[PDB]
Paper text:
To secure the SAV0551 glyoxalase III reaction intermediate and to determine the difference in the histidine location between A. thaliana DJ-1 and SAV0551, SAV0551 was crystallized with the DJ-1 glyoxalase III inhibitor glyoxylate. However, the glyoxylate in the SAV0551 crystal structure is not perfectly co-ordinated, potentially because of the relatively low resolution. The C2 carbon–oxygen atom (O2C2) forms a hydrogen bond with His78 (2.83 Å) and a water molecule (2.71 Å). The third oxygen atom (O3C2) is 3.35 Å from a water molecule and 3.65 Å from His191, which demonstrate weak electrostatic bonds. The glyoxylate-bound crystal structure in SAV0551 is similar to the glyoxalase III reaction intermediate (hemithioacetal) because the glyxalase III substrate methylglyoxal has a single oxygen atom on C2. From the glyoxylate-bound structure, we determined that His78 provides a hydrogen atom to the O2C2 and that a water molecule attacks the C1 atom to hydrolyze the D-lactoylcysteine structure to produce D-lactate. Additionally, in the SAV0551 co-crystal structure, excess amounts of glyoxylate are also located in the aspartate-rich regions within the adjacent cleft of two irrelevant chains, which are not dimers.
It specifically belongs to the Hsp-type subfamily because of the presence of cap domain and aspects of its dimeric interface.
Residue numbers in the entry:
A (entry chain B): 4 to 290
B (entry chain A): 8 to 293
Write the structure that this text describes.
Amino acid sequence: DVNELSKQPTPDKAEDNAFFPSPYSLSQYTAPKTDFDGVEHKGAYKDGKWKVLMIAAEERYVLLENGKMFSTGNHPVEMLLPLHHLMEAGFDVDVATLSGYPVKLELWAMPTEDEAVISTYNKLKEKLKQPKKLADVIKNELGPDSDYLSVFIPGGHAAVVGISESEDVQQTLDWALDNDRFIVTLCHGPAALLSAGLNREKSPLEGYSVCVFPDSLDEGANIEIGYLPGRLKWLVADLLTKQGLKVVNDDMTGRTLKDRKLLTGDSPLASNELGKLAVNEMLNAIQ
Amino acid sequence: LSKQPTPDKAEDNAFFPSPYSLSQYTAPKTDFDGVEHKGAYKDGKWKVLMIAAEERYVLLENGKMFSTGNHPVEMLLPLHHLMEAGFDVDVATLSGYPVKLELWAMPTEDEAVISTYNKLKEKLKQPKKLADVIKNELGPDSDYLSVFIPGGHAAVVGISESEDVQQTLDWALDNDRFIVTLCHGPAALLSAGLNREKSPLEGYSVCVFPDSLDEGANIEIGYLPGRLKWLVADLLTKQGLKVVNDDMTGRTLKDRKLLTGDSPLASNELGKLAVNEMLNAIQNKL
């Protein structure tokens, strides 16, 4: 049956005392298909020059308060679905990690039976297995005349790890702000934003509005169904509020939010509509 | 029995070694048979700085990935010898990420190796960040007498093309400290050539994992699921170093303050070697 499935974290045997999410939690929070009913702007951008820069998770394991480790990565749906909208529209994509190490997907959440998500994933495998070093990106491919229109930070739980305290992410968010480019992020992806307020008395993103994954669900429901095998040592939305950001949501409804050029999503549910929002906004800003 | 690589379900198109290759290359116990200098250094100042791997997957020529890490035998057995002589160990990585081991080679029944793992589990799970160590804990008055780079196939990623590892190897030379590495660990020494016509380790002699074994036998028994994209011995040779072996016999070498071992078989004999050299250096004050 489909609620006799275990609520116990399954162990990941590549690592010591580290665990996948429970078969139950996977039965409620994943699915073979996503809620995607096609693209709005197939072929809209033609000139070829504009593209999206993705910053990505390269570390899979998140050490928790009980000493156990959660075996995560970026959420495939939250990465791959928005990118499908963009790529079909005619925006190319480059993939960077902090170190140039391979990108870590939460593969236990791959919608296996979705033509769009799997075909997009195939088109990105190379750039995923062999990303760019983001410091190499700042050095060359940014500046005022950069062909990056926006910087996309997908979610998953792994987005909490390196991405949250990185001077190279800070420098990238400084660039985006100072050249009116989009920052697109969703889920725990917003933990990236904590890097903007590093070595500083106040953040450049103070008074910005974002959808964030609610603390409640990480501190409460996710632990009780064995999605996470222990408590996180701090919470994305809590520290984002202490940096002077307006965390608009507190529930997981698929709500998206534009605010200046920081377009967000609250959860994995918002993947498809954050994809649609960003394509609209990007094509709008070309005028 | 099977030479077919075993799949790893953490990662797309990734594979552990084949259960046959595990039967030949891995064992529940190591040939450890005693420390040689327990309690020898008592003054508790001098420590050892390990630089470990954060990346466990190695992308290969066929597109498949190899699920590795540092070799627990090569990491832990040498650190046991040095810890029991009285040198504490501080673990660093490049981005501060958790240290990745090849847990399929962890000698489960070996008391000394397991004991050492538990003593470091905390420092292994939250290592220091190598660039912070550079900023704060190096210089001429640093309490690191050696820097230790264990092998495992994951030493090939990151470490081998890292300005932080480069600065670290510069320090050791310019401050007369030891560089102790084994197996595929010497791939770290390729960083000394980074952005330089000439490497400061030009001319040094080292033991490395033979090219022959990674190209032929490791592929045939399904240790590796595909061919490595470059070879550590070949690239090292090109930087002007002198690769002194072409086989795995457990050999070791000491060229000045650079101590190398050729394989996981040298783990014990090298640990022995590193403790003697370090104690001998301390005696060379008066």
